[PDB]
Design a protein around this ligand. Structure first.
Ligand code: PCW
Ligand code: PCW
Ligand code: PCW
Ligand code: PCW
Ligand code: Y01
Ligand code: Y01
Ligand code: Y01
Ligand code: Y01
Ligand code: Y01
Ligand code: Y01
Ligand code: CA
Lengths: 605, 605
């Protein structure tokens, strides 16, 4: 199932080595063999256009095994074999110019250009596309191939012979975008300068560092999403304008145009926080950005997050107050058939709103219903307007349904409404833990409780729900032939599981009676449940929750700053303008244009 | 709100760059432009006194962007432009001599001194004052500016031209005080020697290392408060007088005048322990001081701290003894209206002191009242005599009120006095934890209990008082329609919070009855409270109290020595002389003057 692509790849690469061993022409191109390559091309031609296992000529082989002399003898006998690409599906459109560039063969690339090779050869195969299957993402063009391998010789050689500097691949990446997607980040900085040096701006469109992809990303914005910090410090030096320097002081000044959210729908700060990478959050510490989100939060962002956290805390007190005064008449019927098993003595009211203390509650209930529709008007026209659904969004909409269920369940006088009022008194209060991110020291406590549930408890609840089902289905059998008035823990099977879950966690004690003879098999089975499940499997979980606290408190300040960017972006697109002005100091009154700058000085030495 | 100071700073620094771009004269001073600076000053003058955005001439710009030749052409056309300072509020009083010194421009400072520049220019701006807003604290004078940048050339150059070595800024700091407030501490040691070398003592007042500030600190005492250890080892070598050396032995001898508390109101040991810095306690390990407070404590300081801890331990036993024998007659009235809810059967006496076993208690009560006025006579005329109130002071005055409340509450025969007797039996005993600092190994256990309450429990009680209010207001609703004779934990709402606080910490068990049918929603809600709140949020707090024990026991001996200095200073000003003599061996009988020395020998090699 969807794994034969790596199986057919390995059969095709072995099919290449079979046809390279059958033909005497092509076996005389692996190891050069100029004595026989003369003699084979002397016979008549012996089929100079022999296609191998993957669409290849005899000149592709001599360029691939780095045979300079075997191609010089071949090109003098080749009428047009520089022109033909490979005609495969795996390696499609790869001319012989591509192969001679990647191997840094400087003498062969001078040869193929001399016989008029096309430098715009679209190598549109499937072994060159951006994929986790392919270990290389070089591009499509020989200028793109020469840039990724860090060869400063062929790059000068191809531009002189007319290579296009603005060519794009299938993913729309210009030749400066692929250099950001390379592992050797230091060598990609020099190639970023050398390729942009061949940009004579002749009233063409945007000058090669602003050309977007099919997604819309510039090379600056692509270096932010991909977590490329070395190609971010180097690309920022075009944008800072250093003012006066005064001994050790240096009053630099950053441009801040593609970083801050303009009238354009996206910004750099929105792309960093919503991407699926982890190294992209490392770029949120650099000197243009760290002084931006800590200036956008100290002013304009903390007072709008505490006013939004004091209305909600005076809302969920208004909901708790109008819910512990719920109606509750004294009874209707007699004590039903179970003798003393059924203790319940209220059976809440039907439809009486008299007695004016209930009219005070009616004002306190309509606030909690209006307050639960406004949640469904700023959350439901977000997901059903953007489509994708990527987690306190889902704990504030679930609260918003459980109030709206209770309204429908009361107007029709349905009976049991203590169940929607128990998913709203605990989902409603435990969302005040969301507002513990405007405080730095209370911030990543919400991170630890996520990584202890979904990372250390969902991985060890499957080895605890097996021991608990093992010993509760053994405790039930032992106390199945007993009298469940004394020692009545395990009286039926749904209670045997709940009263073994509690004995696991050591919250209830552990049963004994001392006035009766407990069955013999209980004293052995419980003395093996106190060992395998109380001190040895519970105290393995508490140790797993003691190095998830450690590896989060070790990076306390980095997890908080990613909670401030994600809050400020959420609070900027919803809360409108004239209450949230642009950050920084504008141009247009200091002779700088329509750009929004942000200066900062730092003592260096 | 009080953040426009950094906003008006950034607009003013951009207003400088606008007026530097409008004037052809001043734009010909950034990049020197000697072709046009000749042509502009040839026209007529074209306003040689043009003030820019911040009070500046055209010569300030040529000194700020390090333009030597643009000022040489300008000063020959400048009639008096060396004289005028900046006339701003930000950069006020800064002449052009200040700017040429900071940039280490040696050729320009020779020029401005040749045209008779004043070297006593009070640069009394607001961008030079000591503040966390300003990244530099250089001073006011060009001799003060040359000392901070570590230039040994201009410092010789200014003293030859008559710079005052004893000048003071607005904060009273002489030129040796600012060198202690510099980050490069190694380079500030050489400048301390070179500036003090120009001190020919000519029957002037105290020789430049004893001149106080407006606070009263000498440069030696300022190096103690500011935590500057490198400027403390270097400044101590003036004070030690080395005696005989005998192979590896070396019997050095320290001066100990500005360290130990003289008749002067302050000492070095009082300033270290009462300042708001943390690096100031690092200086309390150096060789003059560490052998002082460990000689002031082994004798004279431990026997006066254990006699003061055995009177108090025989006082709080006298208070416990006279409080569990409190009067308690057998009743007055009947069992009041609640059936068996009100179990109480004493209702303490009014005013009977007969039956001579009560006359023994009266002697035991007057000791506990006299003992609680003496606390209010050595503590209340301290805070209301010094004004500022900066924490076992507040747990010994709170004990002193709760005894004095109980005296007033008994003489008027008021009813409920079990509440002031319960803030005095627990505040009174838990102050014997104060006297666990005369013991080295019991010492910083009092530090750990502070940093676990005010540092790890006041930060995580706000994420626990939300879950506890969430589940107690859900447990109350479920057991609101029940019979609270069986399973009567949550019978009213103040008890639902207390019986969920206890279920959180796992001190009471967890309710069950097994003879009745508990409601269905309880078995789900409690099985989610045992997970989110017993093993996952409690065992996150216990891990937070396991790396606060670690980071205090790692520095066990440093926290104890700061508890001995703070005890010895407190016990020296209250307990008078003739019971606490001066430490060290005096002069005046060995030909050394009126100084109090302390010798120590150490094997070196
Ligand atoms: C409608 C009526 C609204 C009335 C008042 C609303 C607020 C008053 C005006 C806004 C001023 C906001 C402000 O200026 O600051 C509010 C202070 C924060 O003070 P800070 O940032 O300096 O703290 C130190 C933090 N550090 C470590 C990062 C340096 O917060 C506070 O008073 C708390 C205010 C209420 C917060 C509710 C959130 C509930 C918390 C749950 C925890 C779980
Ligand atoms: C980690 C998160 C998921 C883990 C889940 C673990 C807990 C399971 C969750 C719910 C199970 C109980 C739900 C209660 C509601 C329905 C009640 C029920 O459950 O029906 C009760 C029946 C009959 O009992 P009775 O006493 O009324 O009749 C007495 C007969 N007389 C008198 C002749 C002796 O008993 C039976 O269901 C017998 C059923 C036998 C065992 C079924 C358990 C399902 C297996 C789950 C595997 C998951 C982990 C694998 C890795
Ligand atoms: C009025 C009647 C007064 C009668 C007697 C008072 C004391 C007798 C005279 C004073 C002699 C003081 C003395 O010379 O030493 C007293 C010993 C300390 O012995 P050390 O310093 O050599 O211990 C080793 C410590 N290390 C590790 C730092 C080397 O302490 C002791 O007897 C304890 C004496 C009472 C201490 C009460 C404090 C309560 C403790 C609470 C802990 C929580
Ligand atoms: C971390 C340190 C601070 C955290 C504090 C957390 C605990 C709160 C502290 C004290 C609260 C209780 C104090 C007890 C004294 C007054 C009693 C009281 O409280 O009055 C009781 C009332 C009515 O109850 P009933 O059963 O007698 O009537 C039954 C009515 N029938 C029969 C019709 C059902 O009930 C009510 O107050 C309903 C009140 C609704 C919830 C108010 C809680 C205040 C919120 C605090 C937020 C702090 C954390 C935020 C982050
Ligand atoms: C009748 C009166 C009482 C009206 C009551 C309205 C408020 C109690 C509600 C209405 C809309 C709610 C907001 C709707 C959306 C959000 C975003 C939501 O953010 C997330 O889910 C996470 C995003 C992030 O991590 O930044 C958190 C709750 C919050 C602020 C809600 C807080 C409480 C609000 C203001
Ligand atoms: C921290 C570790 C132990 C997590 C492991 C998860 C499970 C082992 C626990 C967590 C939730 C528990 C359940 C939560 C609630 C109930 C309902 C309880 O009784 C009922 O309310 C249903 C009976 C009825 O139908 O009336 C029976 C046990 C059961 C299934 C519990 C069985 C054990 C469960 C699956
Ligand atoms: C009738 C008889 C029993 C008189 C009883 C008097 C003592 C029981 C009281 C009176 C004054 C009290 C003292 C008043 C002041 C202080 C300083 C106080 O120091 C601090 O608060 C912290 C200072 C530091 O950290 O060094 C600690 C308690 C102590 C020694 C008190 C110890 C107990 C004393 C001697
Ligand atoms: C009747 C009920 C409400 C009991 C009330 C008890 C609290 C009011 C008391 C009991 C124990 C006290 C604590 C005991 C010990 C310390 C350590 C103490 O730490 C230091 O003083 C260390 C610094 C130093 O070296 O002086 C600070 C006060 C504190 C937290 C105390 C704070 C107040 C507490 C919690
Ligand atoms: C270690 C963690 C859990 C600290 C978190 C702090 C709070 C969650 C705790 C600490 C003190 C507790 C309070 C201490 C004492 C009381 C009084 C108690 O009943 C009373 O005495 C008042 C009722 C009446 O008026 O008669 C009700 C619970 C309450 C408020 C407790 C509720 C829970 C509190 C606020
Ligand atoms: C009636 C019974 C079933 C009670 C049901 C309780 C649960 C449905 C609730 C109560 C507390 C909740 C948790 C409270 C806090 C968090 C942390 C929260 O973490 C973050 O959002 C961190 C990331 C960020 O910074 O936004 C994720 C949800 C989670 C696990 C919640 C998941 C759902 C929980 C377990
Ligand atoms: Ca128990």
């Amino acid at each position: 199932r969807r794994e034969s692509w790596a199986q057919s790849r390995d059969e095709q690469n072995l099919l290449q080595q079979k046809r390279i061993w059958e033909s005497p022409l092509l076996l005389a191109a692996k190891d050069n063999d100029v004595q026989a390559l003369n003699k084979l091309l002397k016979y008549e031609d012996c089929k100079v256009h022999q296609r191998g296992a993957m669409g290849e000529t005899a000149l592709h082989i001599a360029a691939l095994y780095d045979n300079l002399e075997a191609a010089m003898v071949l090109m003098e006998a080749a009428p047009e074999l520089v022109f033909e690409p490979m005609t495969s599906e795996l390696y499609e459109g790869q001319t012989a110019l591509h192969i001679a560039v990647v191997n840094q063969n400087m003498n062969l690339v001078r040869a193929l250009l001399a016989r008029r090779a096309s430098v715009s050869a679209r190598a549109t195969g499937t072994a060159f596309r951006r994929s986790p299957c392919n270990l290389i993402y070089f591009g499509e063009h020989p200028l793109s191939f020469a840039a990724c391998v860090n060869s400063e010789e062929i790059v000068r050689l191809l531009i002189e012979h007319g290579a296009d500097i603005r060519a794009q691949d299938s993913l729309g990446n210009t030749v400066l975008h692929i250099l950001i997607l390379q592992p050797n980040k230091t060598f990609a900085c020099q190639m970023y300068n050398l390729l942009l040096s061949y940009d004579r701006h002749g009233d063409h469109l945007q000058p090669l560092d602003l050309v977007p992809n099919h997604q819309g990303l510039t090379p600056f914005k692509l270096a932010g999403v991909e977590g490329n910090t070395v190609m971010f410090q180097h690309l920022m030096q075009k944008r800072k304008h250093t003012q006066w320097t005064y001994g050790p002081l240096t009053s630099t000044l950053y441009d801040l145009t593609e970083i801050d959210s303009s009238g354009d729908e996206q910004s750099l700060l929105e792309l960093i926080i919503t991407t699926k990478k982890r190294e992209a959050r490392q770029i949120l510490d650099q000197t243009p950005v760290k002084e931006l989100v800590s200036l956008k939060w100290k002013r304009y962002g903390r007072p709008y997050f505490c006013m939004l956290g004091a209305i909600y805390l005076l809302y969920i007190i208004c909901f708790t107050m109008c819910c512990i005064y719920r109606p509750l008449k004294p009874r209707t019927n007699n004590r039903t058939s179970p003798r003393d098993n059924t203790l319940l003595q209220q059976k809440l009211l039907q439809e009486a709103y008299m007695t004016p203390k209930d009219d005070i509650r009616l004002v306190g209930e309509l606030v909690t219903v209006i307050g639960a529709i406004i949640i469904l008007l700023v959350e439901v026209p977000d997901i059903f307007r953007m489509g994708v659904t990527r987690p306190f969004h889902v704990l504030i909409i679930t609260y918003a349904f459980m109030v709206l269920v209770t309204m429908v369940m009361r107007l029709i006088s349905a009976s049991g409404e203590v169940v929607p009022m128990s998913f709203a008194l605990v989902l409603g209060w435990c969302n005040v833990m969301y507002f513990a991110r405007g405080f730095q020291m209370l911030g990543p406590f919400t991170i630890m409780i996520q990584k202890m549930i979904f990372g250390d408890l969902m991985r060890f609840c499957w080895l605890m729900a097996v021991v608990i089902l093992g010993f509760a289905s053994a405790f039930y059998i032992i106390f199945q032939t007993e009298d469940p008035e004394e020692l009545g823990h395990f009286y039926d099977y749904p209670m045997a599981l709940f009263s073994t879950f509690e004995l696991f966690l050591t919250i209830i004690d552990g049963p004994a009676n001392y006035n009766v003879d407990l069955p013999f098999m209980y004293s052995i089975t419980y003395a093996a449940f106190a060992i395998i499940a109380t001190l040895l499997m519970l105290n393995l979980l508490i140790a797993m929750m003691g190095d998830t606290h450690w590896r989060v408190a070790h990076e306390r300040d980095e997890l908080w700053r990613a909670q401030i960017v994600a809050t400020t972006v959420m609070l900027e697109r919803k809360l409108p303008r004239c209450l949230w002005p642009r950050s920084g100091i504008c141009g247009r009154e200091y002779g700088l244009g329509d750009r929004w700058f942000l200066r900062v000085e730092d003592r260096q030495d």
